[PDB]
């Protein structure tokens, strides 16, 4: 009864707060696709069609954590801002003590520890967001790590999140296993972008425009978004092809 309601271990041992949290992501309906380039990490995502009240050019999903790590957040819009603080703050922490910013793997470890703690106290609850940290680490090269509300985490060759993640997985499965390549072996980062957009349009079935886009590219010792001018220039090549 009671056990189930508040945080504490149910009879079954299930954490109901966590199960509900996973439903919560899907409620924003955000879909993502991330692939590994040869020397870049390209992550692209949807953004719901703009309102005339809003400004269409604003973004609030992308957050520059550090030079190395960019982060795209899928889940509750209010909690994404909450999460963005903790990643930057611990990023800077590592610069003082250990003298440089966190790697991608190492930032995931830290958020996961924090997630676990939030679940035990009553007052504190797990952040309902699913966080997608993108980086090119030097040692691991191109890297994506997916960190979960639970405090669960694992790297990916390519990842997908959302209600229609089901469709993207099936497309990427086809893409990457048959070829037999762990990541895209194309050298120019531009052609990784060309091509990740192409897979998004195919897989969910709906064409993207500048307004839905938003292109994140992380490289060695840099995380950048593409200028609006360049977003439109990738569109011309996509259509002809």
């Amino acid at each position: 009864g009671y056990d189930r309601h508040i945080t504490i271990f149910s009879p079954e041992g299930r954490l109901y707060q966590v199960e509900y949290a996973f439903k919560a992501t899907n409620q924003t309906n955000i879909n993502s696709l991330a692939v590994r380039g040869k020397d870049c990490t390209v992550v692209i995502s949807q953004k719901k069609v703009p309102d005339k009240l809003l400004d269409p050019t604003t973004v609030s999903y992308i957050f520059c954590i550090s030079r190395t790590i960019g982060m795209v957040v899928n889940g509750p819009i209010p909690d994404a801002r909450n999460a963005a603080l903790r990643a930057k703050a611990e990023a800077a922490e590592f610069r003082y003590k250990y003298g440089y910013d966190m790697p991608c793997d190492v930032l995931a470890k830290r958020m996961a520890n924090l997630s676990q703690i939030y679940t035990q106290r009553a007052y504190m609850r797990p952040l309902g967001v699913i966080l997608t940290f993108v980086s090119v680490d030097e040692e691991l090269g191109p890297s994506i790590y997916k960190t979960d509300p639970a405090g669960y985490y694992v790297g990916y060759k390519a990842t997908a999140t959302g209600p229609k993640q089901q469709e993207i997985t099936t497309n990427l499965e086809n893409h990457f296993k048959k070829s037999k390549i762990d990541h895209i072996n194309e050298e120019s980062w531009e052609k990784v972008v060309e091509f990740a957009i192409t897979h998004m349009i195919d897989a969910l079935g709906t064409e993207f425009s500048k307004n839905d886009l938003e292109v994140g590219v992380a490289t060695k010792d840099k995380f950048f978004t593409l200028s609006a001018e360049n977003i439109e220039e990738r569109l011309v090549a996509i259509a002809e092809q």
């Binding site: 192409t198 195919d202 425009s209 307004n211 259509a239 092809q241």
Partner: protein, 149 residues
């Protein structure tokens, strides 16, 4: 797509270059591939409605060559590339392409052509799941006639 200037703009563009169709046709006499190149830009309309207008011009072309044996290859090969890549969905522009597909099937002009054409034509429509299979099967039957001998 979301942009609605293409709808009007493109309908107008097709019509003015349809009055230029005989110019394209004379250049086609000297070099089909060059007249083909102009039409390729044209059948990359983004909007479907104007695609339908523009796909008329392509239908007219192959009648006048009557009929190519090297240039028609690029054309078969391209239609494939447009549909598989995007086409902006596999169905979106591909109804427009159906009238383009239709012309090979029903032309039946020269025995020389007929043998060669069926192997190339059925290869294209294979992995599509619309009307094309009804056509695809019938032309297959024409190779069976040859195979009887």
């Amino acid at each position: 797509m979301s942009r609605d200037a293409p709808i009007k703009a493109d309908k107008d563009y097709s019509q003015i270059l349809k009055e230029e169709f005989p110019k394209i046709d004379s250049l086609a006499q000297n070099d089909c591939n060059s007249a083909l190149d102009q039409l390729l830009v044209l059948e990359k309309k983004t909007r479907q409605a104007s695609d339908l207008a523009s796909s008329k011009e392509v239908l007219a072309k192959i009648v006048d060559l009557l009929a190519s044996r090297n240039k028609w290859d690029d054309l078969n090969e391209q239609l494939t590339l447009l549909s598989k890549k995007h086409g902006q969905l596999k169905l979106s522009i591909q109804y427009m392409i159906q009238k383009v597909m239709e012309y090979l099937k029903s032309s039946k002009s020269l025995d020389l052509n007929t043998r060669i054409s069926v192997i190339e034509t059925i290869r294209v429509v294979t992995e599509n799941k619309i009307f094309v299979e009804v056509e695809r099967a019938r032309v297959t039957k024409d190779l069976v006639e040859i195979k009887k001998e």
